[PDB]
Every structure is written in C-alpha cells, then in structure tokens.
Amino acid sequence: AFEEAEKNAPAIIFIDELDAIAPKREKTHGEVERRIVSQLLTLMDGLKQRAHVIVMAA
Amino acid sequence: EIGVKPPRGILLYGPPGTGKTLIARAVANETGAFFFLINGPEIMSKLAGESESNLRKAFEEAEKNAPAIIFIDELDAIAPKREKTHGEVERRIVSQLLTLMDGLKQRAHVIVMAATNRPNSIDPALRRFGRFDREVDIGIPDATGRLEILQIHTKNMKLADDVDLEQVANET
Amino acid sequence: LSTAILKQKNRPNRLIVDEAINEDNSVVSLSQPKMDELQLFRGDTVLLKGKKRREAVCIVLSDDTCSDEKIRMNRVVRNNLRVRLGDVISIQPCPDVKYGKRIHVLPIDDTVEGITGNLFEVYLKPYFLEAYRPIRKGDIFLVRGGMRAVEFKVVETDPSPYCIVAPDTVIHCEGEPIKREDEEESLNEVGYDDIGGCRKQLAQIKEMVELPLRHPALFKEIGVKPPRGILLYGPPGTGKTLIARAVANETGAFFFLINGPEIMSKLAGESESNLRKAFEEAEKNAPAIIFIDELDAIAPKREKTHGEVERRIVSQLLTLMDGLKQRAHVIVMAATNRPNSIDPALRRFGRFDREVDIGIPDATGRLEILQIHTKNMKLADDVDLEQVANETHGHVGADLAALCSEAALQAIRKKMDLIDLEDETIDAEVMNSLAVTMDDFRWALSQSNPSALRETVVEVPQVTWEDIGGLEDVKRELQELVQYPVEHPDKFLKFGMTPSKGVLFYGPPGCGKTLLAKAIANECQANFISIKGPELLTMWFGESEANVREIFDKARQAAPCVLFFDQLDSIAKARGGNIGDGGGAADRVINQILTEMDGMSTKKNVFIIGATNRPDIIDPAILRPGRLDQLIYIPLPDEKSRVAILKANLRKSPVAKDVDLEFLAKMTNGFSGADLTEICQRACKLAIRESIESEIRRERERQPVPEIRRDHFEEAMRFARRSVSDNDIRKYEMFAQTLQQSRGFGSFRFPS
Amino acid sequence: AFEEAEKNAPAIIFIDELDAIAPKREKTHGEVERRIVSQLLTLMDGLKQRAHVIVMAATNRPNSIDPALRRFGRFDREVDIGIPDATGRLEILQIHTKNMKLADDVDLEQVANETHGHVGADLAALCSEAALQAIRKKMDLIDLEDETIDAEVMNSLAVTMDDFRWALSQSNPSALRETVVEVPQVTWEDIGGLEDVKRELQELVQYPVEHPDKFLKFGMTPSKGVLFYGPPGCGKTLLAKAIANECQANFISIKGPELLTMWFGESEANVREIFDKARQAAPCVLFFDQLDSIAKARGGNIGDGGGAADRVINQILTEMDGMSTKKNVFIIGATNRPDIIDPAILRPGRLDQLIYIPLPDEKSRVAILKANLRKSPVAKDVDLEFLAKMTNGFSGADLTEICQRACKLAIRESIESEIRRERERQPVPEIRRDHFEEAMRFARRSVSD
C-alpha cells in the first residue's frame, strides 16, 4: 500500500481504524500485531523521502 | 599484535527516539565498509523457507562485500525467545540468525548491528558473546547532551539573537 | 577410566618440541641416545605427525645440545605441524622415499610483493640446488634472500605426497599467489586442544567419533557396533559448535554440516529431498560425519507441531537415521540448547543414542578455557589467570572469551593517546609497548557478568559494608554464608555436611534489609539476581510458575548465585487464604517455589535470601529449614547502632566538629535507620537553603556554608518523627518471641 | 508404488512412518496432504481387486492416523508391538549378545531382571555400552594415537559381568529421557525413624510386581495410590528420593505446576503424556511432589480463572481410573496441606493409601541425628540422646539445621585458626560439644502446635 501510494507521489493515505491494526507491541500477545506495528514504524520513518505523500490515520 | 579478534556484534537498545536508527545511518554514511540494512518485519514471509533464505541472502551479500556492516532494525520483532514462541517460522528464523552469526562457519569480516526498544525480549542465545558481543544503551540525554541535540537540530534554521538554547535545554 | 582415551603414555616416538639453533627448514635434530633408542641413523628421512591431520618430513641430524626427551625444530616445521613449543609429536622412519619427479609450489602473495626478481631464480633455484630436501604437500617453507624473504606453498608433489627435491627436479613458481589470509585461517584452526573443560565430554566424543575410525579392529573383534548418534546439549556458549568444528578439523572422515533452517524449502517435498541428498552424500563418501546444528529448528515434537511440512521433515529424519535401509557407517552429531524440545523418537538408541551434556565449567575448567583463549594474546608477567578463573563464577567459556576480548580492548584503549585514529599506520614503538596487563583483566572482570544473567541485570547503588551501621553479627553471618561454601568446600566435605543456603530478613520498615541486600550484591563474591516479588507473576495460565522455574534455573546455572527477593510476602504467601487469585495462581506459585527450593533435584550453591516486612503471613513451608534456614530479625537500632548509622550517613558529608552524634543517638529512641538518614538529609537541605539564600544576597549586591552546622541539625531534628509506632514493634517482637520460645530452652548445656 | 506391487505379485508394500503421509483430513490445512490421504484410501480400497498385494504400515503415533484408514477392508488388522517382559528382554539380550565375546561370569538373566522399562533398543544400547566399557578397560594398554594393536590385547578383550553392571548403572529407558532428574543418593539408612513407613513402602512397591497371583487368588487388587501428608520437613520428599534410589522400579518425579501450559488443551495433553510414559515404563513410580498444586479442590477457585485447573484435575482423575492393575504404575503424592487436596483424589481406587508422616518422636529424633551425623566426625562426648530429649517439637529439618549450624561453627573455628597460624608465621579434628551447644541456641521449632 505504501509503495502504491508513493508511486502516485501526490497521494494521501488514509488508515481507518488505526487502533485495531496498531496496538502496543509489548501489551498484545499476538506476534502478528507487534510485527505489523514495527513494519508501520519502518514505513513511517522512510515515509517522507521529500515526497508529496502524506498519511492520515483515524 | 594483541592477538584477539575485535568484537563483531553491537546491540543498540533504548527508548524510542534516542537515535539508534540515526546512529546506524551515521555509521553507514561515515564508514568505509559495505553496509546492508535489514528491517525486522520485511524479512517475514508466509511461505516456509523464504525468511531464512532472505537472511542467508543478506549475510551472503555482506560476506561477498567484506568487510561489511549488517544493521538489523527492530530486532525484537524478528527475534523473540524460542521457548516463549509458538510459531515454527519465528523459531526457525531465530535459529537461522543464531547459525548465521555464530555457526561452524564463522563470519570473517562482517559486523552485525541491531537496534531494539526492548532488549529483554530478545532470545538469550543472541545476547551471547559470539553473536552480539556488546550492548550499547542509547538512553535519555542529560541537559548538556540535549543542548548539543538542540544545536544540531537548529543549525540549519535561521535563529534570532534572543534565542537561548541553553534555557530550552534546561527546561526540556 | 572415562578419560583414559586422552593419555599419550610417553611412547618412544613421543618428543617435546624445542627451538632450533641452526636447523634449516627441512631438517630437525635429536639427541644421539634418542636415535640409538629409535635405531635411526644420521641423515635418515623421518616423518613427524602433528595436530589436526598434518604430517611433515625432515632429515634427522645428531645434535649434542639437543635434549634427550626433546626434538629441536624451527618455526617452519612447527607451523607446518600446527604445533608450538612444548608440544608432543611422534617421529617414525619413512620408507621408500624417492627423488621427486616434479614439484609445483605457490608463493604467498604478501611475500612476493616488493621483489622484482623472479621467484624461482632468486630463491627456488639456489635453495633447491643439490638440496636433497624431503617435502610434502601442504607445507609452507620460507626462503631467505632479496629485499623480502619468500614463503612457498608446496601444492603439488610428484610422487605424492612425499618427495625429495633433487637437482633434476623441475621447480616453477608460476601460479596464483596464495593469500596470506587463507594460510592464517589455516593456522588458527580449531582442534581438540581448543576445548577447555569438558574433559569427560571430550573423552566420550573421541571414543565415539575417533576410536572406531582409528582402531575399528577393537569393535570388530568384540563383536559390537559402536554408537553412531551424538546429541550435544547445554546452555548457550558452552562449546557445542566449537566441538563440532574441532571434530570437522580433526577427522579423516568426510564431514557434512547441516544447519537447521537451511533445510527448509518452499516447494513440496524439497526439504525432505535436501535431507535425503545430505544423507546420500554422507553414505557415498564412505566414513562420514553429519553434524546438524540447531537441531530443535527442524526436529520439533510431531505431536506438538501444527505444520505438515515440519512433521514430514521430522519423519524423514527418523527414517534416514534408523529405517529399513540402515545407515552405512555414518556418524550423526547434533547440537541444541533445548534437548527436551527434540522429538522423543529421535532420542532412542537407533538414532541419537548418546546425549552429551556440555555444561557450565568449574574453576579448573574455566582456568583451562582462559589459558586457551590467552595462548595467542600478549600478556605481561603480572597477569594471574588463576585469580581470573576464581573470580568468574558463572561463566561458560563464551563469557571467558568476552572477558579476554574486553581486556585486550582496554589494553588498546590505554594506548589511544600514542595511537592516532586518522594516521595511516601505527608506530612500531607503540606496537612493542602494547601488552595486556593484570589491570586490564581486572577491569574486564569488573565489567564481566555471565550472559545467561543479562536479562536479570539491575543497577545496584554501590553499597559497602561500611555504609551499614550496626548489624555487625548479621554482616558476619552474611559474609560467611556466601563465602564459606564457595571458598572452602573442602571444609564442608571434611565435616560431611552441606551448607545452609537460606536467610529471611524480617523486621520493621527502614531498618536495613534492602541495605544488606545491596551490600551483598556489591561485596559478596558470587552472582546476584534481584527479584521484586510480583514481577514473576503473569496473567497467563502456568506462566507465573514458568517464570519461577526460569529464575531458579538461571540461579542454578550461574552458581554460586545469590537470589534475593525484596518483598517475599508478595510472592510467598500462605496457601488457602485467597478466594480469588486466579485459578489458584498464587498457590501454584507457592508450590513451584517450594519444589524449586527444596525438591528432589540435586542442591547447588544457590543462596536464596528474602526480605519481608511482615513474616507472619508467609507460608510455614517456606520457613522450613532447608528453605530459608535462618530467620534473621532486623530490629530498630539501639544507641550504639544509632551512633554507627549516623556516622555512616555522614561519613562522606562535611559535618562541623561541634555536632555530637552521640547526643543525637541518645535522643532518637525508637528511630529507624531511615529516620536518622532523614534527619541528616533534612540538615543537608537546610544547609543548601542557607547557601542558596546567601548566593541570592550576593547576586542582589552585585546587581558561606562550608559544612553542615549544629543549628542545621537542630532545625532538622525538630521535624523528626518516629516512623515505626510502638504497636509495630510489639508485633515484630511478638513474632521474634514466638520464634525464640519455639526452642523452649534459653540456655542449652550438655550434662557432664 | 501400488501398480509396481501389482506387476510383481505376490507383493508386500511396507509404509514406514504412516502418520507422515496419513493424518486426519479434518485437521489438515494442506490440499496436497488431503489429496494424498484420499489417494491412499482409494488405493487401499482397490487393493481388493489387486490379486496378492499386502500393505503393512508402521507408526508410533497410531492415534494420529486418519480414522477412515483404520476401517474394514483397509488396515483392518493392527499389531501392538509392546514393551517386552522379563523373558522377552532376556531373549533380546541373547540376540544382541550372540556375536559379542562375553566372559563366562556374565549372567544375562540378572540384566533382564534389572531393565524394568527397556524396549529392545535400550537393551541394544546397554550391550553397546557394556562392550564400550570393556574396550575402555584396555585404553591404558593401547593408546588412541597408536597405529596398530598387539594381537594379545585383542585376545584378552572380552565383555564381563562388571561391564554389564556398569551399563545397567548408566542404562535408563529411552522414554524417560525428558522426565529424568538428578536425584541425590538417598538411602533407607539415610532416613531416621519412619521404620513402619519404610516397611510399608517397600512392601507396596515389591508385592504387586513380584506376586500378583496371590492378589488375584484372594480377589483383592493391590493399592496403586499413596498420598504422603504431614508437617513440612518430616521426610516425604526424602522418602521419595529413597524410593527412587533403592527400588528396582522406574521413577518419574514431576514438579507440581510443571504440566500447566497457557495454550488451551496443552495441560491435559501433558497429563496424558506423563501418564502414558509412566505406563510404558511399568513397573514405574509416578511421584507428585506438592500434589495440592496439581490437585486442588474443585469449585474453590472455579469462579476466578479460566477453568483450566479443573480440566487438569479431571484429566488426572481419568488417568487414575484408566489404569488396569496389570500395569504396575504406583502413584505417590506428597503434600503438607492435605486439607486443600481435592476430596475426589482420595476416593477409593485412586490414592487409596493415605500415610501420615508425623513430627518425629524421641527415638525417631535419635535415629535422625545419627543418620545426619553418620558421615561426619563427631566427638564421642557429644551426647545425641540429650539433644533428642531437648528438641521435643523439632522436625527432621530442624535437627539437620542444628547439625549444619554445628558444622559451620566448626568450619569457622578451623578457618580462624588457619588465619591465626598464617598471621603468626608471617586444629579442629571434629565437631565438639561446645559447637553443638552454640548451635542449639540458634535452633528453633519450625512447626507450631
């Protein structure tokens, strides 16, 4: 999703229900959710890249 | 001359924002060695054998371009304790890391670096000597260190004369 | 008997390596009576065995200066044989040695640099002119001459592998120069000598992977087939992979290395195909050894495994290891930190019949490991490796390598002033001044801490026995508790009684229990694990007891280890008194603690100390001797102890001489240690307040308090309160009197 | 495979590790595995059309096999290759020792009687280890680095009964490789007093295994369950250690909460596995130290928690009921809190015999003091009878603590004497009466009235 949005560099990403996808890595027993939180952190770190892509989460 | 091998494993740990990834980027830019960067979740795959193969490919690429520095960001996501992990894939990934860093074949010139917010969630076999030799705590800076951070982050901006960065360092 | 396979027994061939006065690369010298014993004449070609499957050939010459029990050889022959001074090698006559038709030699890359002249013409042709020197494949020989002497690798011999370099033999230096790094990696190759400790384990391994190959006639005559499956298990860093490398380097059998995760493949049946290919490769190559590192990666229990691929891989390994088509003389070795995670069907005699515990070494074992790891290091004369071996209580061998590396790194740090990071190269004077002293090893010891305890590391506030005032008897008991079983086990064996290893501090708040724990953590010569009571408890079912089991296992591995519980009554409370507490989670934690502390397992030097602020609620089985043997009562300090506490608090504090601590201790009746510390802190705060007001006054005039004074202490005292009320002392004295009256005899005297 | 079997008929198709390719299709998450199970079903159904092909399969997880494969017309016959008895173990030993060079003193009958839980691979391991010990005894005469061996060394080489006894000392069933624990060498003479308990335990262990015919003749089934209850430190775990070291029965010792697992269904599976591997090693003793953790009163904590402990205790009750008398699996439970043991556990047929390990009396205290000081150098004037008299309410642990405190006082005296001698340059042959006198004032009674 991040790659596709960055392709269309004037892009806005909207992550609806961010609470479900991104819980606390330590608090949640599920390893899938801690991994997805870490991947989202990595994507946000490189998100800017001096690109028009912006991300809004609800 | 001194007859030892210099330590080959660095584990940076600390709360978020201390600059572990920043230090990794600084090392990547300012060292004269091949740099390979690994993100924890990006290794994960559904198919059995893909993730261990990705780790093997990264370590082989580092070995070919030796001396090299491998940085594994978000080590906690990729390497949980095998006793407390149910999934076979994660346990096999941790075993592949253990073998790659310290196995019957040892890495000659590759430096393996990692960063994690929670070092105690790492499998204790990784925190052994031969694999992650030293653990470096990137902690909360003091007043002078955070004044240095403010100076670093304010160097590009144009600042008025009234700006007093030592006061801001004291207050934060 | 178990280690009987390790002795050399001093056969006539056995000889001690010694330095060579004038012996060239291709000759060695012995004592004349030694030749007469071996029936060797001067000039006879001889064959010398070495370590890690190496052989060399030399010309034996008579040297009167050579010792009777020693053989003189230069550095070249030593490096060819991978031996050092003092090593024992066997010399035997070599029959049917003939002049070599042709030899191909490959020079080392670093030596040939800076030599414009032809390598053959400048060095090989005069060196091998009428040389009559015996050589073998794989040897390094150095030839002097030119600007830099040149090392040649004899890669090809005709006839192989032994040949005499006659003048008619053609010598050619063409070819890719040999890398210095490759020969260096060949030199620093791991053999059975690089494993320290694990003497019985190494004996068993050599019995199983070396003896059947070296002397198969024994097993053929005695009519049995030797064991063919070895599972090396142990905590991380104990040397399982090291033993695997040693076996790989020091066996003539073909060696196949399997790493667990490498087997896996995404395709259907491709992992089973990889396993079959590995076993077919081993079978094709006659005697072969298969080593599977990280066995738990690809051999989980089939009953506990959900994926079908993993179960099929376990079944494939089961069939390959012991199936209808039997193994054709193949030794299978495996290493794992989790032997109980392996499939139970793999652990039987047919497949993995011998399980070898590479455990935590003792003092002598870790001394041996330190000697092995420092054999290459440059050491000063001041270094005492026995002291370092005694200091490192819970180290496994990887921790000792870490300690040696830290010492070397500190030694390099001490030279960072003379050394420049930026400059191209380091001065030779600095390199000659570089050495590892005992101070570097002391620093490494200070930083050293067993890796298994890395998770259970807490920053302790550096308390000394002097920081505690009073409690002299308690200090002596604690020091003796931690020191006697560790430093004098022979005394306990002589008196035939195991030591007591349990102490419970009970008393009013603020009287010095946690201070005693800090003093133990900083002063006692043992590992220390600090446990807050409820941190072990977990929401999940069976995980709180798992945490208890894990922490006790960590204390067992790092023995001698001190296991301190800051609030015991939280983790240790009487059973049956909780309506909720999960599904009896607290009671199950109590029972797990009871089993871990005194059960059917063998007892180790694990000193378990608990501090409780109210001991009447702790389970009575916890206080049973053999668990918390001594119940030490830490009461409110008396006047002497109050003087000691006040002096200890103000020892580092600049205090005016007018302050009479005896009068303070006399007045403060019923005060605890925290009360007196608060009095001193309040005096310090008042002094700081006065100094700040004085500084404000000087600042006002621009636009004092050198030490804490008597009036500061008086104003601090007017705020003082007695934290522990009389009823609290009544309760603690009630518990203490129950304990004392339990015995029933104030004075016990034997009848005369 | 099936077509090639038909081409060359009569044919036998052996499928080793049948559970590898034939799991239950409902539990399978792979399409290819389910298709393989269906193909096996189809081929075994069509086996009737095939003239003389016979399919024999081997598996050590028969319950994991797809149930449809065990129906009529396909794998309809099942052969249980069970654990051999004493005579069967003798036959296996005779088979494995036929090629070895046994000495005359060897007695395979004794070796057959000792190996209570061995299955045949264990007996082969035992023979291999005995021969390896025999080879070890010659490692003094032959060095490993030697190139060749004298023929006389081979001629002298032979396996003797001492080698087999060493092997038996090292030998253990392969099944009990995960439950094995290091147990201290506790002996019946290490325990002081408890003579009636010792005799009762020895009889309860030996009589059912040695003479079941008398119990069948009188029609009474031997008791297969014992609970130990008493004050802490009175000798329950010590008795368990003595049983493990002395009795010729396989011993499984498990900690209380060892079986519990957070994952749903795993604790019941752990109970099933422990009881099954107890049956496989019969005659076996299954000891439950701190039983009240494993078995607590149902409904007392039902509301608080998920209810997994109730499932665990129900599974335990099912396993206690499921055992036939023919399997000699003695179950011993130990607890110092019998009041919180589940009442169902003590019902007839499960943990029948309830034994009260009491606070020792004066004669038992003399026995305990002698047993503790048996290996210790104690002065003659030290009167143990008076120590037993004065320690009225003391338990065995209390007396052991008194002796340990006296030992530590003696060690302190010796250490200080050595320090003093080193100081003067730059003792304590045994424990004395003053040491015990000093140790007694620190002594306390651990168990209250």
Ligand SMILES: Nc1ncnc2c1ncn2[C@@H]1O[C@H](COP(=O)(O)OP(=O)(O)OP(=O)(O)O)[C@@H](O)[C@H]1O
């Ligand atoms: N010590 C520091 N000195 C200067 N700038 C810093 C420092 N720490 C953080 N920053 C600034 O804040 C940003 C965030 O830091 P960074 O992403 O490295 O944090 P982190 O918590 O170590 O990372 P991650 O959790 O992704 O490993 C940096 O890119 C930099 O701009």
Ligand SMILES: Nc1ncnc2c1ncn2[C@@H]1O[C@H](COP(=O)(O)OP(=O)(O)OP(=O)(O)O)[C@@H](O)[C@H]1O
């Ligand atoms: N007994 C020993 N003697 C000498 N060196 C040792 C010993 N044990 C470990 N080492 C050294 O310490 C390190 C331990 O690494 P090694 O791979 O041998 O450990 P391991 O027991 O296989 O660990 P893991 O369980 O994590 O695989 C190596 O550098 C090895 O040389």
Ligand SMILES: Nc1ncnc2c1ncn2[C@@H]1O[C@H](COP(=O)(O)OP(=O)(O)OP(=O)(O)O)[C@@H](O)[C@H]1O
């Ligand atoms: N004997 C002592 N000598 C010096 N300071 C003492 C002494 N006893 C207590 N203190 C002081 O008490 C404070 C800490 O007390 P500590 O943590 O040892 O108490 P505690 O007995 O463990 O209490 P609690 O029951 O509340 O956990 C420190 O300020 C320390 O200086």
Ligand SMILES: Nc1ncnc2c1ncn2[C@@H]1O[C@H](COP(=O)(O)OP(=O)(O)OP(=O)(O)O)[C@@H](O)[C@H]1O
């Ligand atoms: N009859 C006895 N003879 C010799 N020593 C004994 C005797 N009874 C107890 N002891 C010793 O006293 C201590 C009691 O420990 P033991 O394991 O026997 O206790 P337990 O009855 O299982 O109690 P707990 O309920 O506390 O687990 C041990 O050190 C043991 O050696």
Ligand SMILES: [Mg+2]
């Ligand atoms: Mg390893």
Ligand SMILES: [Mg+2]
């Ligand atoms: Mg405290």
Ligand SMILES: [Mg+2]
């Ligand atoms: Mg007990």
